[PDB]
Design a protein around this ligand. Sequence first.
Ligand SMILES: CCCCCCCCCCCCCCCCCC(=O)OC[C@H](COP(=O)(O)OCCN)OC(=O)CCCCCCCCCCCCCCCCC
Lengths: 139, 163, 48, 80, 344, 98, 97, 169, 105, 317
Amino acid sequence: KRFFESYHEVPDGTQCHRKTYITTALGGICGIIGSAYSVSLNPADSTLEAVARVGRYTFTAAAIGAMFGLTTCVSAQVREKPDDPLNYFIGGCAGGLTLGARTHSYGTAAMGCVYMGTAAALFKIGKLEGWELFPTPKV
Amino acid sequence: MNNYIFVLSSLFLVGCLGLALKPSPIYGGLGLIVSGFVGCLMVLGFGGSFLGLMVFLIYLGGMLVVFGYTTAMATEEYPGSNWLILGFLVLGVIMEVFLICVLNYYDLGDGLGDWLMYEVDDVGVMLEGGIGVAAMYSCATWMMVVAGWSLFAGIFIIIEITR
Amino acid sequence: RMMRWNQERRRLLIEDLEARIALMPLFQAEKDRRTLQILRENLEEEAI
Amino acid sequence: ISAFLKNAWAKEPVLVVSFSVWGLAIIMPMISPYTKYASMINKATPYNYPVPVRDDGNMPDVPSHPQDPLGPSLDWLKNL
Amino acid sequence: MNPITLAIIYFTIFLGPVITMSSTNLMLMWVGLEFSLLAIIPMLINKKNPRSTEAATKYFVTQATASMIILLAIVLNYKQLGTWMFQQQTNGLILNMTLMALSMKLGLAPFHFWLPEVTQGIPLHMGLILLTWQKIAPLSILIQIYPLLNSTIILMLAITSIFMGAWGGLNQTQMRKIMAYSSIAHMGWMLAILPYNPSLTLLNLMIYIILTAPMFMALMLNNSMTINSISLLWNKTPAMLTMISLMLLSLGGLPPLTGFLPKWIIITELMKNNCLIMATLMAMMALLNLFFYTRLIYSTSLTMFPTNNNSKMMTHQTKTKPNLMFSTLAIMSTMTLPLAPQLI
Amino acid sequence: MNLYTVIFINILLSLTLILVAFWLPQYSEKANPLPFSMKFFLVAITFLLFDLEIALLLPLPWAIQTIKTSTMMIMAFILVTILSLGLAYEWTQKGLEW
Amino acid sequence: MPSTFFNLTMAFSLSLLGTLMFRSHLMSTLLCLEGMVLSLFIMTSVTSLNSNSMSSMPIPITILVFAACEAAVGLALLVKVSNTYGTDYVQNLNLLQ
Amino acid sequence: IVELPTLEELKVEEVKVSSAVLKAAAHHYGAQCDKTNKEFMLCRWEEKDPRRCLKEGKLVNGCALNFFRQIKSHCAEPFTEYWTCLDYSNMQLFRHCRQQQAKFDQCVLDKLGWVRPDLGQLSKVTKVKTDRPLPENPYHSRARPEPNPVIEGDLKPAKHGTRFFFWTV
Amino acid sequence: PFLDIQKKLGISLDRHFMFLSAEQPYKNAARCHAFEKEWIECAHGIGGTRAKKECKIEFDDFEECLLRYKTMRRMHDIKKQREKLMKEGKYTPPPHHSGREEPRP
Amino acid sequence: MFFINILTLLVPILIAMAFLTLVERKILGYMQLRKGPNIVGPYGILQPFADAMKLFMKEPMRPLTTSMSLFIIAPTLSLTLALSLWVPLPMPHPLINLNLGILFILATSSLSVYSILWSGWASNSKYSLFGALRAVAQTISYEVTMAIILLSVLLMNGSYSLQTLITTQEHMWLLLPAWPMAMMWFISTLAETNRAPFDLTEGESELVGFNVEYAAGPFALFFMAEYTNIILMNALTTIIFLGPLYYINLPELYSTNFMMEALLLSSTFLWIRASYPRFRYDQLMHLLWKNFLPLTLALCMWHISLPIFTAGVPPYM
Ligand SMILES: CCCCCCCCCCCCCCCCCC(=O)OC[C@H](COP(=O)(O)OCCN)OC(=O)CCCCCCCCCCCCCCCCC
């Protein structure tokens, strides 16, 4: 776990390799979990068919992970501004686009871009403003 | 031996792995009846003569037997060869050894030492299970009443379901 | 005859248990100094 | 009611006994001269050791010695 | 049911939650849960229709394994602390088990599959008990142990439930299952504030009970398990159309009605505790719940669906009345909001 | 131990006697050789709900010697009775009847 | 004990995996379900016995008494199912979809 | 190092006679050698440590050997015939060797002036006076924490009323 | 608990037997009866939030009266040491291991 | 010399059982006015060796059984337990001393049920499955009446130790305090052997029972285990109800008088076989569920009071 966290430790826009690798893993992990629920429920017809679906979901998710990581890191590199929700949005923007392609739908890319990017941007803001998620009870 | 309990514990896991591969309804009943025998033995190891025998008396022949009974009446359609299951089961027999092995090298360990009967009065009586179970009638008489209602309303629950 | 007899088995137990009461001191004394002789003697084998 | 018991004693002569001894055993303890002793004969048994209390001189009853006239003397359990 | 059996069962279904709540020895809390499991199964199969046996056999297996997991937590604690009850020291995994298990008996989040299906095959009446007098027991166990449970998991089960409940409800047209889905959702809010302010869980429950109990006795007054069936309410009994309208919008969070308070104070407590991430997402999809509530509103009240000719025959005959509880629980529920300060 | 030896010897004797049985001897269709007994199942769980009954009645031998003897008596009688009333309901239910 | 207590716990998890991965006959499940109660009964009895905690021995049995009835209910549902379908396969229990 | 007495210290002449003879001469061992045995217990239950009452322990291991030493000179032969039958049983019951008992009791009623106790005269809790200072803080209990302080006073209607949302209450 | 019908009614059907130091039958104290006492008379009047930091000495001890694991690590280590030395004969089975040494009452 | 004990504990019961096969054929005979075996030996003393040395030589035909594993584990379970319930038997000196002895005898006795279940199920046949289900019903139903008789009686000797029953009987037989228990015990020992007026299983006129598909060895064992606990459940009555003499000295007298009463109770079952038409399966149950079980539960309640009001609570140990 010390791993994933590393993504945040190094300043954004720097060491994109690590960023892309980490982001790709998270997506892939989600892919596995997502495929699992998708196979446990709404099962397949043959073991192979399901192994394929696991692969499909895993790769698609890994891809959205990569492009998000790559775009955000590079956008920051090229733009030279490390702290900017916009970097992430461009990244989320891209991530959605990959999802759209994998699903072969321009429309999905639309919602995907907006919704996904917005979400990622909010993550950046969240980190920048020190928003706390799942907080301990401090009442 | 000193590994009097471990070995047994290992057999208990084997029987549970057999029930877990969900073998034919009655072939596995045997499996339970086996690990119930095994669990009966371990408790005896620690001095729980009563508590132990109790299991051999109620879950073994009372609950389990009734279970298979019903299997015969239904769900013993006896339409995967359990032998395939035995094949897998054999895999687990040693696959569990793998799980233990990692911690085996990691090592408590070296069988089982004084990891049983931690403290026993080298003098004295009345120290024996069944004195504790008989607290149902002195100082723990609420567990006794609620168990009653379980069995008592059990009658009424079963018939109502059956009807 | 089961009234009058099982009463006696009680009175024999009291006779038999009070014997045990008189010898807790000797045993508990031996048991203290014995186990208190094991682990100085094991403290040594660990330390000596 | 009293002559209904007469066929239930001729035919069905089992449940009669089972509801005549089920109960008899609930009234024998409440009405017997000797039921007091069961919680007393069972209270005298010294299974564990009687720990002696330190003397202060403020305790007259506590029998100093096992053979003092004082203390729980059961000349009852004997010839109960 | 031989009225004697009815008594024994009903007593158990009622001694079941009560032992749980009263006792502190967890064991005694477990058997309280066990009784409830045994008592509910007979009533579930009263019609003994083929759907029913399916319902009970699912409810029972889901309930039984969860009961066994709760017992394992108590058994493990017994060895990590001699006590028969969770304490500050309790291993975190020990408590998480209890959360998952108890979240299965209550049917929250990723274990929300059994409830909609058992709510579909049981009568409307036993539906209420299965939804509201069987949630009191497990929740009691959680509320007691709140200081020790994890804020992260609860929140995830909370948010998930809200979403699953909402999304599930949108598609459903069977009423029994629309309610099952709502209960999953409301149950979610309840478990969200447990780690922070248990006292509010007990409000978000009562209000749910004071809202759902009138709503179901409404569904059964005409025994309609279909929206199409409840839509012809205007012909069968016109008066309940007004309150059915407000109670369902009350079940969702719309502001003038009593239903806003539970969501409002839960949001106030979560923001007080800084979960302005979590609270926001919950409130937003909470709005999805009202969409399916209002879609039903449309069919039952705001628009008059066409009825069959035989409906005139049922009008003729005097309609067996709805118990008084409906009224007292419809009003105390649709409009108590002006009295919120004292409720909390 | 001794108990182990015995129970184990008792097994070996059993096995040998079937060993000899299948080997001493050393086709023809010689080998060639149902509805639910709801009554039976009932009888079976009647026995389960009663065997557990015994398991809660076995402490009597060690509870008779409890100080609160009056309490034991009371606690027991209720158990035996509530279980008899159950059987009795079965009787009326005719579940006992075969 | 610490070593053994593990085996029993994994026995309960192996029994857990069993009841959470059905396959055909239900009677198998209920049977598995019982495998847990045995593992819980054994573990409760074991620790109570090596803690010399006699005040708690009541529990090891209360666990069994409640578990037995629990199973009684479970089997009556099972008999009810192979009376309505006569094959007791978890497979046909899908009308509620 | 946890204090553990020197083995040399623990050395004490010992009883070394099988359980049977102890069971025979026990009821007289409760009459005699009681002040020296109860004070051990009174240390043992008060001072919960076998590393502190070893003093009175050596006394118990002493008075007992005294008890028998008299019996060995006085009235030894009838004592040998007593436990020699009593040890034949599998639980060493007095119920069998009942004739050997009076023959040893009259031999010891006359000589040494001992009288065997009545039935219930070893189950009473005698009060033994001793000098061992009371073992305070037994269990070596580290000082306890203080109770949370107590807010004090009397209730006064709440300030400005329920401070809810615009409910002027 | 959630509804304290027990304290109110004064009955104690469920409290008398919740900890190892509760009344054990025939007054046969369990293992650790000493500690748990010391760890609950400490945390009495002090709520949990403060029964978890300052009353940590008594739980750290009671967590080792019952688990008794730190001991294992000691003993297990000791065991290994003996083994290595013994293999090179550095250490010899003690007189105790040789038996005798005057096993006494 | 512990092994000398087993060798002198199992040989003298497999050699006794063998001559119960004989004695169950002669005593039944002379009641039927027909001499039993007279020829192979002097007076039939050498007949069981013949069909012992004969059955084992007949083909143990595994007849298309579903599972040998069971077909060959059931018959062994039986003789394994039956010859084990003898290990804790309370002679003046029992092979092994077992507190919880009477429970041991109860528990092990129960396991036997499986033999019926397993054997019936494995051997694929209507008769086999039919008989088994019906047979165990009986066996199980009679355990619940045995246990209580067993429990009730315990309150009187006050422990689960067989070896104390002898002391409790140091001056009287428990037959006189509890003849009602001893009646229902006799039927619960006579009908839990699937024996006597009660042979529903192995119904021969109606059912051809479970052991039907068994032959040669597999059968012999099942049989050997019905006559080696035809002597137990009479040997217990000669311990629990009929208390022979026990003197610290002369420790044989007990065994000798144990003989004299165990043969009667083993010869009393033989009058039954030759005297009573078989109960019908429904009646057997109604004998236990609606007649014996009621009386048994009430008398159990009576015996928990008798100690308290007579202040006769027996001495633990
Ligand atoms: C905060 C404000 C919240 C909103 C308040 C205003 C909306 C109230 C809720 C209305 C919800 C239902 C809307 C649709 C109703 C349809 C009614 C209908 O179809 O008519 C039949 C119905 C029953 O008929 P029946 O009375 O039996 O006799 C006539 C038979 N045809 O006829 C009837 O039902 C008659 C009785 C209807 C109920 C009367 C309610 C009057 C309006 C209440 C306003 C309250 C304002 C509070 C302001 C608070 C400010 C702080």
